[PDB]
Amino acid sequence: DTHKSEIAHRFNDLGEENFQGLVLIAFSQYLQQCPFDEHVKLVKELTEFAKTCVADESHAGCDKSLHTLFGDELCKVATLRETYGDMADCCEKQEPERNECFLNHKDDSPDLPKLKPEPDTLCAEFKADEKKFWGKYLYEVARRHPYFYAPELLYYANKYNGVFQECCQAEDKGACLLPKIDAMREKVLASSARQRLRCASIQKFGERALKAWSVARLSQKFPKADFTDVTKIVTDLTKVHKECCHGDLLECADDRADLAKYICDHQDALSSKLKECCDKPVLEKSHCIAEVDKDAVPENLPPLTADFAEDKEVCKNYQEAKDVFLGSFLYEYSRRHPEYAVSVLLRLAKEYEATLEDCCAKEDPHACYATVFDKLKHLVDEPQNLIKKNCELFEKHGEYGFQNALIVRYTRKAPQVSTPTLVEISRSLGKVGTKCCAKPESERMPCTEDYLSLILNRLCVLHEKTPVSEKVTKCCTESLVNRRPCFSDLTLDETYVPKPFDEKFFTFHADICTLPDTEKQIKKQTALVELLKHKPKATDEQLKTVMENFVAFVDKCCAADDKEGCFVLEGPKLVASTQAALA
Ligand SMILES: O=C(O)Cc1ccccc1Nc1c(Cl)cccc1Cl
Ligand SMILES: O=C(O)Cc1ccccc1Nc1c(Cl)cccc1Cl
Ligand SMILES: O=C(O)Cc1ccccc1Nc1c(Cl)cccc1Cl
Ligand SMILES: O=C(O)Cc1ccccc1Nc1c(Cl)cccc1Cl
Ligand SMILES: O=C(O)Cc1ccccc1Nc1c(Cl)cccc1Cl
Ligand SMILES: O=C(O)Cc1ccccc1Nc1c(Cl)cccc1Cl
Ligand code: NA
Ligand code: NA
Ligand code: NA
Ligand code: NA
Ligand code: NA
């Protein structure tokens, strides 16, 4: 029955608290530069209207689309044009174009103040008003991460409240809190980047691209499931993801809850690992299901060669329904190989497709396709060889030195990219060494390829907004499945014209001496990028000499009596020695 008030329905389904949270998240993601207490006022107006429609669904306006109602609140914001410029032009449109226009203005790098955890203040805020404290967390994250997957953010906010519940009772609040914040922050940044990649997949490559990624991932998690159980779940899951990517946050959350319930009702057909998820309350249940471990591969699965290489009829089977035959290939390959990266499984399925396209046209197709697994294996061997070599490099240098080796590599590949992005991306890539290299053998390929696909996606999302390198545009737009190898294959960009030495990056005031370590690292890594932008062909030894003099010089002026005097008067010596080392 379609005679439904949508707002009433979502309020009925989700409950007041989650409804309010999701509405607050929607406003914070679309209007990232509005204060908390202004969005709270809008949430409260829409909650009062929802409750009116719950009481009486025939009440005037209860029949508007939820998204239409929300858009209307946006366009009634007095400071819309003033703060968001021509985002206010979006107000002239009809749905769904109005919404697509709003989504166009979400800012991926709003460069908002860095949140410093002050444990004494936060514990006071928390004790003062817990709900406010909860909403302030949803607002601060959502406005920094405007594609953050909204129901997961509700889950993280409950865990964030739990952290303060335990830690505020301690004597040293700081010692309890800070390691937990740190843990949270890494999990929330990864989560943001994961959902950002799902949104950019849908938008730039079609919803079929995301479906293929999810078929591969779900078949590895739930290897006893039938192909059509996987395609049903992937279909519902992709609709949830797309709804969240399109800002339909109440519908995304409501659908997600229905999917969690479906998976728990069918847990016998899917995975034994689901049992611990399925008695949890709804947000925790869903989270637990998304993070579930790969079930054990069943015994007795026939070898892949039986259907895909050995069988006489591969071409006939393929030609009858090419898409279904390849989806089934992907599913069969993925359930069998939890130790492969999902992107490697997609690359395997693409190459299997190209082989059949080629072989099935020949006189004797079977002699040509019988050996396809030998043609495929280089797609497993190449990433395995890269992972071994990059994890060695990581163990040789440590995380910071590995970040610096990545700075050199990426600035050579993409020297037109702005310095702060080269630094951010190289720092994130270096942390993949920390996150993955010490893992069990069967987890290293999924771990490193997954993180690379998140971080290269972040580069692609930034570069889409201000494209400066043709080679980045090619790697970012050509094919999602080959994005990571496309970047690995970039060498020194030969079209790049060097800039003059940008000496501000090698000149400091005394306040450098008391920067926290992360910030000192960033100052040094920024200089390193700038070296390469001035001298793209500089040798690793030249770079090392320079950077060694650099740290020697900062060390010396930091230990001076008159620090600023040293930096200012001795500074040009560093700048001349740097130009000599590079000559
Ligand atoms: O209103 C309350 O009881 C707690 C409170 C205090 C300050 C600001 C907001 C809120 N609640 C609140 C929150 Cl935290 C999020 C969305 C909507 C509302 Cl009404
Ligand atoms: O730190 C970020 O950039 C976002 C983030 C994610 C998870 C947990 C905490 C934070 N930031 C954060 C901090 Cl560092 C302090 C107080 C309140 C918040 Cl939301
Ligand atoms: O760490 C940063 O500030 C860069 C950044 C911005 C937005 C979202 C994620 C990230 N970093 C990041 C990424 Cl892109 C992937 C996995 C894990 C992390 Cl911490
Ligand atoms: O068939 C595809 O294009 C990929 C795919 C993957 C998982 C689940 C379903 C599908 N196909 C599919 C699609 Cl793309 C749209 C609507 C319904 C279905 Cl069954
Ligand atoms: O980065 C590359 O080109 C090689 C490669 C391929 C697949 C997966 C990871 C990696 N490299 C990689 C690894 Cl294996 C660990 C930490 C950081 C990086 Cl950049
Ligand atoms: O290794 C050092 O002590 C010199 C130094 C200081 C700051 C930043 C980088 C470097 N060295 C460095 C360089 Cl210049 C390039 C690739 C890898 C490394 Cl570890
Ligand atoms: Na099946
Ligand atoms: Na729906
Ligand atoms: Na391929
Ligand atoms: Na390479
Ligand atoms: Na300077």
Numbering used by the authors: 1 to 583
Which passages does the manuscript contain on this structure?
Serum albumin (SA) is the most significant transport protein of vertebrates; it constitutes up to 60% of all plasma proteins. SA consists of three loose domains, that are almost structurally identical and mostly helical. In this paper, we present crystal structures of three animal serum albumin complexes: ovine, caprine, and leporine, with diclofenac, a popular non-steroidal anti-inflammatory drug that is used in therapy of chronic and acute pain.
All changes in the Ib domain in the OSA-DIC complex are primarily caused by a large movement of the Trp134 side chain, which caused conformational changes of Tyr160, Asn161, and Met184. In the OSA-DIC complex, the carboxyl group of diclofenac interacts directly with the hydroxyl group of Ser488. In OSA-DIC, the ligand Cl4 chlorine atom interacts with its own carboxyl group and additionally creates weak halogen bonds with ND1 of His397, and carbonyl oxygen of Gly401. The diclofenac molecule in the OSA-DIC complex creates electrostatic contacts with its chlorine Cl2 atom and the peptide bond carbonyl oxygen of Leu115. The carboxyl group of this ligand creates a hydrogen bond through a water molecule with the NE2 nitrogen of His145 and the guanidine moiety of Arg185. In OSA-DIC, a unique diclofenac binding site for DIC6 is observed in the large space between the first and the third domains, located above the place where these domains are approaching each other. The aromatic ring functionalized with chlorine atoms acts as an anchor, creating electrostatic interactions in the deeper part of this cleft. The Cl4 chlorine atom interacts with the main chain peptide oxygen of Leu454 and Cl2 interacts via two halogen bonds with the carbonyl oxygen of Glu186 and the side chain amine group of Lys435.
